[PDB]
């Protein structure tokens, strides 16, 4: 329940393939096979990111969601490409249980409110993708590649105000490094919101999950290290 497995996928020669290391590594593993494995290992939720859709605002990859839905009984978080109200409806109709949004929310924060006021707050996860810039935490869109000029402290406050239910807090610089979560970013964010925080990016071992919880994370997300060591999913699942 505190364990989210983030699966990043892309069509490669007609096949849905799994990507790790912040979308830089084609693992050669099929989405089909990895989804089956992650549930078997004990994950509580799946964050399903269609890496081709991120930042594009063209809609969620509902083909990918429909593909995955009969493979698993786990809640699915649709991620990548949300741009308007109708996009969320399509995601739910494809089988998603919650929806995640970054780029279009930054550009139009009232979208968060629109979603929450229809599909509640708990169905809405706002993905915050941040890093240190000139000594301050700043917010980025398009998976971290595009600046906004918005401070993390400001955005966190706004996100809750607009009615999000959960924050997915990704440290751009930690993703795929397996070097630990950005616990200073987490600690920074914790007293700014009452919302459940999902720590994202950098998990490499069991003690990393511990430090994240200690810094204030309510749930933890794992991609790269889980693919390399699926039993890690079980160990953390059996613990929290």
Which residues of the chain form contacts with ligand PI (CB under 6 A)? 6, 20, 54-55, 79-82, 101-104, 141, 175-176, 200-203, 222-225
**To the nearest whole angstrom, how small is the minimum distance from the Cβ of residue 222 to ligand PI?**
5
Six-digit token string for 166? 């959960």
**To the nearest whole angstrom, how small is the minimum distance from the Cβ of residue 52 to ligand PI?**
10
Q: Which is nearer to ligand PI, 168 or 195 (CB)?
A: 168
Q: List Cβ neighbours of 218 (8 Å cut-off, separation of 6 or more).
A: 2, 196, 197, 198
Q: Which is nearer to ligand PI, 62 or 223 (CB)?
A: 223
Nearest residue to 112 (alpha-carbon basis) of 95, 97, 128: 128
Beta strands in 102-196 (DSSP E): 124-133, 136-141, 146-151, 166-171
**To the nearest whole angstrom, how small is the minimum distance from the Cβ of residue 102 to ligand PI?**
3
Torsion, Cα of 203, 223, 142, 170 (10° steps): -30
Q: Which is nearer to ligand PI, 125 or 195 (CB)?
A: 125
| Contact between residue 7 and residue 31 where contact means Cβ atoms under 8 Å apart | yes
**To the nearest whole angstrom, how small is the minimum distance from the Cβ of residue 143 to ligand PI?**
7
Spacing of C-alpha 192 from chain mean position: 20
**To the nearest whole angstrom, how small is the minimum distance from the Cβ of residue 60 to ligand PI?**
9
Distance CA 56, CA 5 (A): 23
Q: Which is nearer to ligand PI, 163 or 201 (CB)?
A: 201
Q: Which is nearer to ligand PI, 48 or 175 (CB)?
A: 175
């Amino acid at each position: 329940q505190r364990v989210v497995v983030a699966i990043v996928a892309k069509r490669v020669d007609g096949e849905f393939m799994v990507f790790t290391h912040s979308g830089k590594k084609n693992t050669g593993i099929l989405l089909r096979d990895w989804v089956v494995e992650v549930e078997k290992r004990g994950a509580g939720e799946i964050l399903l990111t269609s890496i081709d859709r991120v930042g594009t605002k063209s809609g969620y990859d509902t083909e990918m969601i429909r593909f995955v839905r009969p493979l698993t009984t786990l809640p699915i978080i649709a991620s990548g490409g949300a741009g308007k109200m109708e996009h969320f409806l399509e995601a739910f109709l494809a089988g998603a249980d919650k929806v995640s949004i970054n780029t279009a929310a930054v550009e139009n924060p009232s979208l968060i409110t629109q979603i929450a006021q229809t599909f509640g707050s708990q169905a809405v996860v706002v993905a915050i993708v941040a890093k240190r810039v000139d000594g301050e935490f700043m917010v980025f869109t398009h998976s971290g590649k595009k600046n906004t000029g918005i401070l993390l402290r400001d955005w966190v406050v706004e996100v809750e105000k607009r009615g999000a239910g959960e924050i997915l807090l990704t440290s751009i610089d930690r993703v795929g490094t397996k070097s630990g979560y950005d616990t200073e970013m987490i600690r920074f964010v914790r007293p700014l919101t009452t919302l459940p925080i999902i720590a994202s990016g950098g998990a490499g071992k069991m003690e990393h999950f511990l430090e994240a919880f200690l810094a204030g994370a309510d749930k933890v997300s794992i991609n790269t290290a889980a693919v390399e060591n699926p039993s890690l999913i079980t160990q953390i699942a059996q613990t929290f």
